[PDB]
């Protein structure tokens, strides 16, 4: 992307229904810090995700790497509060060559002290005037009445701490729905009535594939038993139902 959204109003581009070539992420070295929670930082290619989220924004000054599950601060708590159960991770790399302006990109608002705090994952573009002293203020600024945005301040020679680490949060949810987006695998021919190691749209195990007589509904992709273990899958290429 040419330009990303600011940290208070960060964009959210949902990706679904395609093949995700994670190789371009795994083998790349331009990513300064790939310190990756939730899943392995290297072998992203061997999972299928229910839904993938991409919150991309820019943070510098303090809190350059304070975006982590179980972290607090001015940037990580009052502008974008990454949840403490966060499954996914953060790609960050300095963008001095391009995103940092020749003078200063004074265009990344970061809204220090909104009211009290933020719960996980709500984008709040609300500009209400903050009040801490004299309450008479009503959408008007006064003695103790603030307009809270107060944008970032970056320069090409800011320094490593004040250097913009372009954050791209791949926030994965692995147990939300049938998987729709994942890795670039060869895809082999289907084999029945034999002991095989299978990977059905991210569901992995070893077993024998047989013909099912279950009446799956058109939107429903797989089943589970009383034991809450997988016992049926719809083939992702031909809409045939198999018992596993």
């Amino acid at each position: 992307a040419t330009r990303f959204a600011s940290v208070y109003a960060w964009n959210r581009k949902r990706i679904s229904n395609c093949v995700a070539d994670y190789s371009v992420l795994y083998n790349s070295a331009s990513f300064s810090t790939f310190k990756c929670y939730g899943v392995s930082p290297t072998k992203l290619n061997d999972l299928c995700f229910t839904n993938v989220y991409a919150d991309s924004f820019v943070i510098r000054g303090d809190e350059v790497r304070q975006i982590a599950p179980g972290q607090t601060g001015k940037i990580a708590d009052y502008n974008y509060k990454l949840p403490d159960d966060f499954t996914g991770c953060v790609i960050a790399w300095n963008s001095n060559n391009l995103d940092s302006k020749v003078g200063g990109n004074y265009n990344y608002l970061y809204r220090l002290f909104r009211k009290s705090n933020l719960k996980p994952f709500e984008r709040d573009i609300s500009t209400e005037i903050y009040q801490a002293g004299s309450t008479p203020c009503n959408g008007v600024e006064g003695f103790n009445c603030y307009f809270p945005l107060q944008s970032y301040g970056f320069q090409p020679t800011n320094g490593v701490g004040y250097q913009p680490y372009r954050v791209v949060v791949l926030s994965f949810e692995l147990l939300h729905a049938p998987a729709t987006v994942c890795g670039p695998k060869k895809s082999t021919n289907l084999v029945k009535n034999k002991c095989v190691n299978f990977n059905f749209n991210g569901l992995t195990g070893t077993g024998v594939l047989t013909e099912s007589n279950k009446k799956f509904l058109p939107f429903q992709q797989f089943g589970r038993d009383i034991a809450d273990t997988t016992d049926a899958v719809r083939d992702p290429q031909t809409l045939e139902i198999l018992d596993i």
């Epitope: 371009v24 795994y26 083998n27 790349s28 070295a29 331009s30 990513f31 790399w93 060559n97």
Partner: nanobody, 129 residues
């Protein structure tokens, strides 16, 4: 990054030389070390290249004469010139190929192929006369 070169000089036809190219700030190992000659008012026509180890890659018109080696101790590429001919008269540049993470381009991960050229030195005029 700076690259200093030496060895070129006025010699009669059929002589011998030794081209020396010393690199400060990087070595002969980091990136591909190529050799190009840029004839006066023509393109920079690639001559040869010594890779990070073990190459005898030459141009079609100069096969079997040029010999390429390195002293890694002093970080110097030597290009020993024997059996001159007419077309070798040019300014010779020891070219630094675009190293791994070329200008921190955000797509190429450890693919050292990257067949372009990074910054080089100022070049030595090598004339056959």
């Amino acid at each position: 990054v700076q690259l200093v070169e030496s060895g070129g000089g006025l010699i009669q036809a059929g002589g011998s030389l030794r081209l020396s190219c010393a690199a400060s700030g990087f070595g002969v190992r980091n990136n591909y070390m190529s050799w190009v000659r840029q004839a006066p008012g023509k393109g920079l026509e690639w001559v040869s290249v010594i890779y990070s180890g073990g190459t005898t890659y030459y141009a079609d018109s100069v096969k079997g004469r040029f010999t390429i080696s390195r002293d890694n101790s002093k970080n110097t590429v030597f290009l020993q010139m024997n059996s001159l001919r007419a077309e070798d008269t040019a300014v010779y540049y020891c070219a630094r190929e675009g190293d791994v993470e070329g200008f921190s381009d955000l797509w190429s991960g450890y693919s050292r192929d990257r067949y372009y050229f990074d910054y080089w030195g100022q070049g030595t005029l090598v004339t056959v006369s």
